[PDB]
């Protein structure tokens, strides 16, 4: 039938543009061709050592998760990509800030409809990054971010900890928090909800028709970005608060076993798994 994750969120998005701040992307992958516009934007740090497994692996997969023809959430959504992560998946706070500013400048020059900005990345708590996100949010833009993959309190990371952003943790096919190596999804009061983030099939930049399964809070956040795009296309006048309320209203309630989280984080971590409205 359909991928487990696409079933999990289903008990499209054409009015909305989704900005992706990530690695490079293979914009002619069949899954996203003609749905994604690669902006001239690039701001990345030099690679350290000689590592990566393609330069565009991460972003291509997430673009597919959001808008992909066969495996996407919001199949009518258009996307715009900015490169703020290098070949090893590493960026800078200052590069991210310049990207967020680019988005606002782009909107002012040529306004369209509702904008969703997907930030599938995390660093340490950052006053300036949090402030920039808050600012962009107040300007009328919806920001969705990854909770982080450090099995830690999301409040210690940015943009996860930012006010006015939608922060997304990862759950697996059994609605349980995702383990990633020795770590896993972040948790805590700064996380808004969870979404499918394990074993998620999506566009592989290895070839124009290739697919690969990936895991992470990036993939989880990509789901919510897709869901947000669908909800905003149906109800374009929603304020951020109303959108947040709709995301909570249509979430699966109390399906996560909270024993996975540290004792004190259980009450603080919302037991919600995102889903589309009926």
């Amino acid at each position: 039938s359909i991928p487990w994750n696409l079933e999990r969120i289903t008990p499209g998005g054409s009015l909305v543009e989704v900005y992706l701040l990530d690695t490079s992307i293979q914009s002619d992958h069949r899954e996203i061709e003609g749905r994604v516009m690669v902006t001239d934007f690039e701001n990345v740090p030099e690679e350290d050592g000689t590592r990566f497994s393609k330069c565009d692996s991460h972003g291509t997969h997430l673009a597919g998760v959001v808008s992909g023809r066969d495996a996407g959430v919001a199949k009518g959504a258009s996307m715009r990509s900015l490169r703020v992560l290098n070949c090893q998946g590493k960026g800078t706070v200052s590069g991210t800030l310049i990207g967020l500013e680019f988005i606002r400048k782009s909107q002012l020059v040529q306004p369209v409809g509702p904008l969703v900005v997907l930030l599938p990345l995390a660093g340490g708590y950052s006053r300036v990054l949090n402030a920039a996100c808050q600012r962009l949010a107040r300007a009328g833009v919806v920001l969705v971010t990854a909770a982080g993959n450090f099995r830690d309190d999301a409040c210690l990371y940015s943009p996860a900890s930012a006010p006015e952003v939608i922060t997304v943790g990862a759950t697996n096919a059994q609605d349980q928090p995702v383990t990633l190596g020795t770590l896993g999804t972040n948790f805590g009061r700064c996380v808004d909800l969870f979404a499918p983030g394990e074993d998620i099939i999506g566009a592989s930049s290895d070839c124009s028709t290739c697919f690969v399964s990936q895991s992470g809070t990036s993939q989880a956040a990509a789901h919510v970005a897709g869901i947000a795009a669908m909800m905003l296309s149906a109800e374009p006048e929603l304020t951020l608060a109303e959108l947040r309320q709709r995301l909570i209203h249509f979430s699966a309630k109390d399906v996560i076993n909270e024993a996975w989280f540290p004792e004190d984080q259980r009450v603080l971590t919302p037991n919600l798994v995102a889903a589309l409205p009926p």
């Binding site: 495996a71 099939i201 070839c207 028709t209 697919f211 690969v212």
Partner: peptide, 13 residues
């Protein structure tokens, strides 16, 4: 595993 087509993925899953 990288699947070379959506059909390939469908056959496997």
């Amino acid at each position: 595993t990288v699947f070379t087509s959506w059909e390939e993925y469908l056959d496997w899953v």
